[PDB]
Every structure is written in structure tokens, then in C-alpha cells.
């Protein structure tokens, strides 16, 4: 109900550690725009 | 009762690990021939 692309991530193997290291961990995502970005029709923002 | 050379392996020090790593381990051997190898008098093999 979007008509947009999507991204997903899957466990291929699983995480393997030696003795004496933390068990769980984390991933972080960063987003940005590439040089070819364009905008039109200045309007008012819906946040204030 | 061979008249052939031999190869042996000895522990010089012993294996040392930190905390949280497996204790035992393994070695593997690979064999091959070098370019100067020659053969003579085709015969029948003793395996089938």
C-alpha cells in the first residue's frame, strides 16, 4: 500500500565468537542523498 | 626396513591461548609432485 521499493537483511550464517567476548551486538544505518537530487514547489512544513 | 627418508614434527613450545578460545586444534598435510617427475614401464594397477 506504498508502491515503493524495500530493503531487508537476513542471517546467512550466525555470529561466532571466541571465549570471553560479549554475545550480542548492534548494527547502525546512515542515510544521505546523492548529487542528483531535485526539489520543487516550496510549501509549508507539517511539523510546527 | 625401508631405506627411505622420513619427516617428523616436535613441540618446541606448546600452544598458548587467551580466555574464551577452544583448547585443541588440528594440522593438515597436502602432497604434490614437482615439475621434474618421470615414470616408466606402464603396467597394471593392483587396486581393482
Amino acid at each position: 500500500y506504498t508502491s515503493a521499493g524495500n530493503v531487508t537483511c537476513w542471517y546467512q550464517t550466525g555470529i561466532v565468537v571466541p571465549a570471553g567476548t560479549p554475545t550480542s551486538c548492534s548494527i547502525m544505518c546512515f542515510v544521505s542523498a546523492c548529487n542528483d537530487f531535485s526539489v520543487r514547489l516550496l510549501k509549508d512544513t507539517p511539523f510546527i | 626396513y625401508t631405506s627411505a627418508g622420513n619427516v617428523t614434527c616436535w613441540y618446541q613450545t606448546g600452544i598458548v591461548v587467551p580466555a574464551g578460545t577452544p583448547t585443541s586444534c588440528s594440522i593438515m598435510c597436502f602432497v604434490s609432485a614437482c615439475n621434474d617427475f618421470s615414470v616408466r614401464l606402464l603396467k597394471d594397477t593392483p587396486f581393482i
Binding site: - | 626396513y1 625401508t2 631405506s3 617428523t8 606402464l42 594397477t45 581393482i48
Partner: protein
């Protein structure tokens, strides 16, 4: 130099020995037949399995010996016997009696030979609508696993060339086969288990090698 492909594979061997009579009451004992493949000779099979694709010509020589049956009748005076050796290409008519019409078809090449002379010999080219033969096929015939129809190589049939009401005789033929002008592709590991039948790769599990005393054991030096 002795490990080249030609010197390793191009060698002659007896691959089929068969017996046939001039008169009998079975009518299948009146001729001998063989289908050409290289899977019922265990020593040639193993050397051929080191490769996945092969291409060769065939050369076949025939050694033929006769005998009068120990039945009863002696005092005979016979001329030397004549034999017919017929090759059938893939897609040819197969005889079912020794009196059949197919022993006279113009497209089945044939050899006529009489005893006392040098042994007969014919040369067959690479006969396949494919580009090579295959020793291994991971597929279905169209359904048999492991069998593809591009490996058909033909058949050989042998009979006596007498007239009507012949005298009783028994002959034995031995076929010697030799590949020539050989080319091979994609090497493979050597067969470790014994072969079980002639059409599959079936096997019973085998040990990797034989044991010794310990992982340190080296025998005392002379």
C-alpha cells in the same frame, strides 16, 4: 613420454569371447553378438574414468577357432570354414535368426573370411552426432538415470557362411579392441570402490586407506 595420453590409453585388449554353432536346437546358439561399450572391461573402465569426455577411433581384430563336436561321426573331409562378421551402426537393423534378411542389408558393413589366413580386422571412426563421448552423465535418458543416447557405438554379429544342411561345428571368437587418436577432457579422481554392475556408479562404502600402528610409527631402518 610414456605418460602421454596416447601411450596410456592406446593399447589392445580382449573385451569379448563368444561361442556359436552351425547346427543346434536353440537357434540363438547359431550366432554371436556383442554391444560395443567400454564398461564391462574392468581394467579399461578405470583408466577411462579419469576423464569426463573422450574422443577416439576404434580398431577391432578377431581371432577365430573351430572344432568338430564330440557327438559321433568321423571320417570327414572338409574344406576350410567361412565366417561372416557384420557391424551395425547406430540406427540399424538387428538380426534375430541366422536366416534373417538383415544379414544382407547394403548399409551394414560386413567381412567374409576363411580359416587359415591372417586374422581379420576393421576400423571404425568416431560415430556420434555429438562432439565427444561422455563417461559420466548426470541426467535422464528422456527414463533412466545416468544414460544418454549419444554414447551408442553400434554392435557386432558373427555367423557361419555355409549352405543348406551343414555339418556340426563349434566356433569361438575373441574380439580385440583398441582406441586410436585419442583426446580427453576434464580430469577426475580415481575410482576408490569396487564396481558393482555395468551401468551404474553404485558402490558400497569403503575405507580411505589401511591402518598403521600409531601416528608416529616409522619402521626400523636397515
Amino acid at each position: 613420454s610414456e605418460s602421454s595420453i596416447e601411450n596410456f590409453l592406446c593399447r589392445s585388449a580382449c573385451v569379448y569371447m563368444g561361442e556359436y554353432h552351425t547346427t543346434n536346437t536353440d537357434t540363438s546358439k547359431l550366432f554371436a553378438s556383442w554391444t560395443i561399450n567400454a564398461r564391462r572391461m574392468v581394467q579399461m573402465r578405470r583408466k577411462l574414468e579419469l576423464f569426463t569426455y573422450v574422443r577416439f577411433d576404434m580398431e577391432v581384430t578377431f581371432v577365430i577357432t573351430s572344432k568338430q563336436d564330440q557327438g559321433t561321426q568321423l571320417g570327414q573331409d572338409m574344406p576350410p570354414l567361412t565366417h561372416q562378421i557384420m557391424y551395425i551402426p547406430p540406427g540399424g537393423p538387428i538380426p534375430k535368426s541366422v536366416t534373417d534378411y538383415t544379414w544382407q542389408t547394403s548399409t551394414n558393413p560386413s567381412i567374409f573370411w576363411t580359416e587359415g589366413n591372417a586374422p581379420p580386422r576393421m576400423s571404425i571412426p568416431f560415430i556420434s552426432i555429438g562432439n565427444a563421448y561422455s563417461n559420466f552423465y548426470d541426467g535422464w535418458s528422456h527414463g533412466v538415470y545416468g544414460y544418454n543416447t549419444l554414447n551408442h557405438m553400434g554392435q557386432i554379429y558373427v555367423r557361419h557362411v555355409n549352405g543348406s544342411s551343414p555339418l556340426p561345428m563349434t566356433s569361438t571368437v575373441r574380439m580385440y579392441f583398441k582406441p586410436k587418436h585419442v583426446k580427453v577432457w576434464v580430469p577426475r579422481p580415481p575410482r576408490l570402490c569396487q564396481y558393482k554392475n555395468a551401468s551404474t556408479v553404485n558402490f558400497t562404502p569403503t575405507n580411505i586407506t589401511e591402518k598403521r600402528q600409531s601416528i608416529n610409527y616409522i619402521p626400523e631402518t636397515v
